[PDB]
């Protein structure tokens, strides 16, 4: 089992640290060079897989399995009856999953019957608009599965919170910046939020395809304006920067 | 003649962070303190307008002092004539810079100031006046062209100052205004702690010391800086909540 | 349908009567004998089924169909096209529903397409956090459906206000005592309240499992401490007593 | 100074404990015998003066000087410059103040520049409606004055929250039952709350002057109906019982 780094940990009883935690994630995976003054995920990593911890107390945390290449959540790990236990998304290959959680062995390595797509998560845990985000919301979703028998509905509700408040919060300033430091306050996930969440690659490509502008703030101008991802109408790269925390990386192998 | 530095189409709520960003871009110095934007120390013209647009035929214009983002008054239309209201404590020399379309007897001095003590006393506690795009629009509809009603004017000012000025001062506030027009957000003790402590939080950054190991390259002169319930142990933590430092 | 008792009526234009109305519910359904000095719903009724009225005016009210055994809301009755009309949640048996509303006859007894679980009510009417409680909020939601054609969103919003401000309020003093005495003021349903609403059985069971004690005001002590219903962390039965209006019956 | 009991202590970081704290005060001061099934402050005490602690942390608390005869708050103690420091309301005589805080001596025994009347507190600290109640609000108000140089605004703002959320919270279920155990949530002190706060003796007198009843739940009926404490219109003693945690002694 390779040595994996824990690149960020969220102490859910310290809610004001949330943007510091998100910032750590952006800092760990981002390139040194920006793209139109927007951070972008690095194309390569020495070790692309890593952990992110979500802490409920000194003896209870869930550990996310992460692919830093795209900030995908691949599964998570808890502890049950003193044994380490790992749950992996259905579509995650054995070779990838084998990188994670050396304390989960044998029957405690569990392939879930669903993937991390929002289609699958909402099928099992309800529509995104019915799972509000928030610090305690995330904490409570952890309490409801930690050390417990596997429940797809509650696993899905946890995954909805964790993917949106960790992975896509890092990807989108628009998401991370809505989470209140008032631990018990919640944000409804509306169509403006889902629109961004479902169009991460489309927006990143629009930054990559933009042209250099000697007059504009981001020093870039869209190749084609507007970029419509309804209900958003993006007329400038600046307006894209206001929602983006990280661009998806570009390998420059194909044409856009 | 004064510039209109930003305008908010209350019916196109996605544009709100562009509108806040236009305010910050207009008033900020070219350079940052500890990598945080700060208000510019001087201005060719320190007074400007900010429009709050309800429709093609209806808007309220705020009078803004850009040196500190204070709202000094607003202007509407009543009986087909331009009209301006100014807070009690605004000098007539300052108020005179604003609204050439408001002449005659239609320039009015309000009986209260723009302080939260005054506004909350007349319009209700900040926790009882939730923020939101529609809430702001509706409060404008509730006073536009109407006889002066101190309570409804105070509710407008509570919404406008927080959703314009302090929204520009604090990313924490501006970034929680939902793009869903009819969604609102409560002004909780984390918001008011920031709102009450803009100068204190700016002073901590201006008094910080160089650091070679932190991302902002600053460290607090003494830690923590407490604006409860916030406990600020680093300048990066302050930076995450700030949109504009108070000008040195 | 037999003639059922109407055990309480809330005059929605006299908002300071609210806790008298909730007390009237508690008094009707509570057993004579308390558990750890907390009221509990009687195990037996001669007639478990009864009415609770929500009154908008002298001529406009909604009548809730109530199972007093668990304070379940099963449906409601209004008037539409000058005829008594009733709605019943999807999962309510015909035998149970036929106990209610003798003036809602003919074809005016309607099966709803959703149940009263919070999952069903919130997918149709929105999250508890987006449906604040309040006298006017309740009254308004009644006006938005009374005598109207079926509208699942508005009906579900009415049920959220009704179940939380009648049933759940009677069960939890913590909830009932937060309803504002001003008609037009409202209170957000936060995660403390929703934790209670989701865990009435678990909390009541924790009281039932408690051990006798001579030194505590409730004369009870927790079998295991704490009882955690996040965000609530209960270390005494006294702390549970002070949130509980009515224990689930044993 | 005599050695006085600390009859209750609120750990402001365990907000769920709040109603238990209030209950401890009521139990301590309440007579064995009730009046119209309302608790009444005992006519006498062997030692009427006592302490209540308001804990912000293991190292920082403020102790209230309390007169249990009437739940008057007479002052508070903190620590400044490594020494006990006492503050007493301006109208409290030396004889009374001498009962409290033996660890504060010399010039560390300080006469406040105002009394505990709401008129004095509002002059110095703002209207009650502009000073919302709340667990963290109270904690924040303590932090803002503990060990600090005198500040009449923050001292007054502390007393507004302390008197309302301790003394009058025990006097009035209406106040105590509104405080959320979500510690950041606040309650607006509107006309319904100030009306109760201003009329504690009048409401208590209305209870003592009440007549017997064989039917009502309290076994009392008002001597004259209604008892109006605007905006409240009390037609029954059951309605008064809903809002009151303690009667003033007669």
Author numbering:
A (entry chain B): 1 to 256
B (entry chain A): 3 to 250
C (entry chain C), D (entry chain D): 1 to 250
From the article:
Mirabilis antiviral protein (MAP) is the type I ribosome-inactivating protein (RIP), which consists of an RNA N-glycosylase domain with no carbohydrate-binding domain. Ribosome-inactivating proteins (RIPs) are a diverse family of toxic enzymes that catalyze the removal of the specific adenine residues from ribosomal RNA (rRNA N-glycosylase EC 3.2.2.22), thereby irreversibly inhibiting protein synthesis and leading to cell death. Unlike many RIPs, such as ricin or trichosanthin, which inactivate eukaryotic ribosomes, MAP also inactivates the E. coli ribosome by cleaving the N-glycosidic bond at A2660 of 23S ribosomal RNA. Mirabilis antiviral protein (MAP) was identified in the roots of Mirabilis jalapa as a potent antiviral agent against the transmission of tobacco mosaic virus.
Because of the MAP effect on the E. coli ribosomes, wild-type MAP (wt-MAP) was difficult to produce by the E. coli system. It has been shown that RTA residues E177 and R180 play a crucial role in the hydrolysis of N-glycoside bonds by stabilizing the transition state during the catalysis of the depurination reaction. As these two residues were conserved in MAP, the inactivated recombinant MAP-EQRQ was expressed, purified, and crystallized. Here, we expressed, purified, and crystallized the plural recombinant MAPs, including both E168Q and R171Q mutations (MAP-EQRQ) in E. coli, and determined the crystal structure of MAP-EQRQ at 2.1 Å resolution. As a result, there were four molecules of MAPs in the asymmetric unit, which belong to the C2 space group. There are four molecules (A, B, C, and D) in the asymmetric unit, which are formed by a dimer of dimers. The 2-fold symmetric dimer was formed by residues α7 (Y174, D177, and K178), α10 (E238 and K241), and α1 (L19) in the α7α8-loop (E182 and E185). Notably, the active site comprises the conserved amino acid residues in these RIPs, including Y72, Y118, E168, and R171 of MAP. According to the assay, approximately 98% of E. coli ribosomes (0.2 µM) were depurinated by wt-MAP at 0.050 µM, and approximately 90% by the single mutant E168Q at 5 μM, whereas the double mutant MAP-EQRQ, as well as the single R171Q mutant, showed no inhibitory activity even at 5 µM. We impose the MAP structure with TCS/RTA with the eukaryotic stalk to see if there is any difference in these stalk-binding regions; in the stalk-binding region, crystal structures of MAP showed that the peptide binding region is hydrophobic and formed by Y174, Y192, W232, F234, and V243. Among MAP and TCS/RTA, the structures of these sites differ broadly, such that MAP lacks the stalk-binding hydrophobic deep pocket, as seen in RTA.
